[PDB]
């Protein structure tokens, strides 16, 4: 039923195109890796070290309002 739930989540179609809608998706508390890769690419766009430490920090917190902060 997880796939069905994912489909339902994708069914909302809140707006095009948003990382804020990506956060609306993380509302379920489950985040796809692709998003993480995109975030890493954005970070890339000492910096590498920060990403390594920033990514670790994001990993440390999975709680609501933490992922948003980690993403920021």
């Amino acid at each position: 039923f997880s796939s069905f739930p994912s489909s339902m989540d994708p069914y909302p179609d809140v707006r095009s195109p948003r990382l804020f809608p990506s956060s609306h998706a993380k509302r379920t508390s489950s985040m796809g890796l692709l998003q993480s890769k995109f975030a890493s690419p954005s970070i890339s766009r000492a910096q590498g070290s920060h990403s390594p430490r920033i990514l670790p920090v994001t990993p440390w917190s999975v709680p609501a309002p933490l992922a948003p902060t980690f993403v920021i």
């Binding site: 997880s2 796939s3 890796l33 692709l34 890769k37 590498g48």
Partner: protein, 307 residues
């Protein structure tokens, strides 16, 4: 007429890996000379090299062949921190002849921040999928989500390990019958991995204990006609582990056998196509073939030597 004789690889520097295709007719080699050679076993029995090209900037540790349904694809692995996918190309004009074959790059995987030890294609049922493990100690899985786009390689997953040696080996079990899982042997404690239901993430089901020395090699055996699974490690000792799922947790290991008759490092461990025979090689310069007993103990059938 047929003869098996020693043949020169044509590699200036040392040869890290040799791999057979699906048929067993073709061989791929890689070395520290930065070149990949592909051999054709002619119908006249002599191996002749099909092609050799400069794949990478730095030494090429590992190579592998994908399933022949996808096409002629070889993946390579280097100290340059890249993996490359290559597709064999033959062109023939809608007329007899006119076909030309040369190595080509489908894609590059830059994501590994450090020198990569190994690369392996997953089983054919899964799709184009491969795993790689590096000095960053991060196992990465890449998929081609479109079979048609051989350049479209997405990064499916990333997991953390430890730091030093590395080897990978997928479960070759056909899926429908079994679930995907993969053993990683680095350096020393080594922990394998399985795949979760719809988390779609790799979990650590269990670990292979009793490992001695650095883990030179690991391979999973084809589970054809057997419920249980077998993995052999060439440490500086040979070990065989039996995995059984049963049914939270759903894994068990037993250690089938240990074998030190090499008296030294076991560099390579390889399995038969059926999983019937295991092989081991080491610093004694001896290659041992193994059979399973009725008791499920392993016995050495015989030993090849060389000097």
């Amino acid at each position: 007429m047929f003869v098996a004789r020693s043949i020169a690889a044509d590699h200036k520097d040392l040869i890290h890996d040799v791999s057979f295709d699906f048929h067993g007719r073709r061989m791929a080699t890689c070395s520290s000379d930065q070149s990949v050679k592909v051999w054709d076993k002619s119908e006249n029995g002599n191996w002749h090299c099909t092609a050799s090209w400069k794949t990478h900037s730095g030494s090429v540790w590992r190579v592998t062949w994908a399933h022949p349904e996808f096409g002629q694809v070889l993946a390579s692995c280097s100290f340059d921190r890249t993996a490359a996918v290559w597709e064999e190309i033959v062109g023939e004009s809608n007329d007899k002849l006119r076909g030309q074959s040369h190595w080509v790059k489908r894609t590059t995987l830059v994501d590994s921040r450090t020198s990569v030890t190994d690369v392996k294609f997953a089983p054919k049922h899964m799709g184009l999928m491969l795993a790689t493990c590096s000095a960053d100690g991060v196992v990465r899985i890449y998929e081609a989500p479109d079979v048609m786009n051989l350049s479209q390689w997405s990064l499916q997953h990333e997991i953390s390990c430890k730091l030093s040696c590395s080897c990978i080996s997928w479960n070759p079990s056909s899926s429908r019958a079994h679930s995907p899982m993969i053993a990683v042997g680095s350096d020393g404690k080594v922990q394998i991995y399985e795949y979760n239901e719809n988390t779609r993430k790799y979990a650590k089901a269990e670990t292979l204990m009793s490992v001695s020395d650095p883990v030179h090699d690991i391979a999973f055996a084809p589970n054809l006609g057997r419920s249980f699974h077998i993995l052999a490690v060439a440490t500086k000792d040979v070990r065989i582990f039996t995995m059984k799922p049963l049914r939270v947790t759903k894994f068990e290991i037993h250690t089938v056998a240990q074998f030190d008759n090499h008296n030294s490092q076991v560099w390579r461990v390889s399995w038969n196509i059926t999983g019937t025979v295991l092989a081991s090689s080491g610093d004694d310069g001896t290659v041992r073939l193994w059979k399973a007993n009725y008791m499920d103990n392993w016995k050495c059938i015989g030993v090849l030597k060389g000097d």
